Each structure stands twice: as C-alpha cells, then as structure tokens.
Amino acid sequence: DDSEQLQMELKELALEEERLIQELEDVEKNRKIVAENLEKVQAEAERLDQEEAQYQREYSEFKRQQLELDDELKSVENQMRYAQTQLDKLKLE
Amino acid sequence: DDSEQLQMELKELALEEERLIQELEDVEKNRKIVAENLEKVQAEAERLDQEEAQYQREYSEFKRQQLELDDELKSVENQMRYAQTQLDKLKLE
C-alpha cells in the first residue's frame, strides 16, 4: 500500500507544482507590466519637471520686468511733475 | 520759448507714460497666465508622484510574491524528489 500512497502523492504534488508554476508566470507578467508603467511615469515626471522649470523662469523674469517698468514709470511721472511745475510758474509769471 | 519747450516735453512724456503703462499691463497679464500654468503643472506633478508611488508598491509586492512562490515551488520539488526516491526503492524491492 506504500507504493500506491506514494503514487497518489506524486500526482497531487504534480498538480500543485503546475499551479505554482502558473502563478509564478502570472506574477512575472504583471511585474513586467508594472515596471513598464513605472518607466513611463518616471519619464513623464522628468518632462513635467522641465516644464515647471521653464514656467518658473518665465514667472521670475516677468516679476523682474515689473520692477524695472515700475521704476521707469516712476521716473517719467517725476519728470512730468517737474515740467508741469516749471510751466505753471512761467504761466503765472 | 521756455514754455513751448516744456509743453512739448509734457506731450512727449505723456506718450512715454502711456507706452510704459501698456507694457506693465501686458506683463501683468502674462504673469497671471504663467502663474496659472505653474499651478496646473504642480498639481499634475503631485498626481504623478502618487501614481508612481502606487506602481512602486505594486512592483515591490510582486517581487515579494516571486520570492514566496519560488520557496513554495522548491518545497514541492523536494517533496516530489523524495516521494519518487521512495517509490523507486519500493519498485526495485
């Protein structure tokens, strides 16, 4: 009866082995898929980093332009106030 | 002639002032646009961070599953080798 028990056990184990092999193949498949997805999102994130860097540079540049133009406008305003003061004095004689 | 020079200067300066005001308005417009774009890409980048985190968790989990299943398969293989050895010995008597 020993031999029959061993034969049955070997058939049971062969079924379990096949189950595990198919599980392993499934996990490997899914792993490759997820790795590809990781590669994709990482590349995407680098491109986004560069896009953000460009916008940040543009934003900072516009702020500096605002500062410069404000200074220029203040200058023009002062020049107008001065010219108008002189003109008013001349007109009043 | 002083008065005429001042009047001309004031007209010139008014033109320059208008030019600068329009420049400033343009820069402010563009600045708002770039700020909105920055907001958008930053939100996008956070979502990408979360997507990457999820994929990374899945990848690591599949690797651990591979380790576990390999150990289980090794066990089943050993059990089969042992059962087959005993059976061979019984058959040889």
- Among B7, B16, B63, the residue with its CB nearest the CB of A87 is B7
Architecture of domain A1-93: Helix non-globular (6.10)
Q: Rounded to an integer, what distance in angstroms lies between the CA atom of residue B70 and that of residue B65? A: 8
Is A20:B80 a contact under the CB 8 Å cutoff?
no
Chain A: closest CA distance from residue B34 (Å):
6
Largest distance between two CA atoms of chain B: 136
Q: Which of these, B85, B81, B90, B84, lies nearest to A3 by C-alpha position?
A: B90
Q: Decide if B70 touches A, using CB distance below 8 A.
A: yes
- Which DSSP state fits A50? H
Domain segments of chain B as ranges? 1-93
Is B81:A28 a contact under the CB 8 Å cutoff?
no
Q: Which of these, B43, B45, B39, lies nearest to A41 by C-alpha position?
A: B45
- Which residues does chain B break after (C to N > 2.5 Å)? none
Residues of A in contact with B24 (CB under 8 A): 66, 69-70, 73
Count of beta carbons in the 10 Å neighbourhood of residue B16: 16
Q: How was this structure determined?
A: X-ray
**Sign of the alpha-carbon torsion through B70, B71, B76, B79:** positive
Q: Tell me the resolution in Å.
A: 1.5
What is the DSSP secondary-structure string of A62-87? Answer: HHHHHHHHHHHHHHHHHHHHHHHHHH
| B51-80: b (≥16 Cβ within 10 Å) or e | bbeebeebbeebeebeeebeebbeebeebb
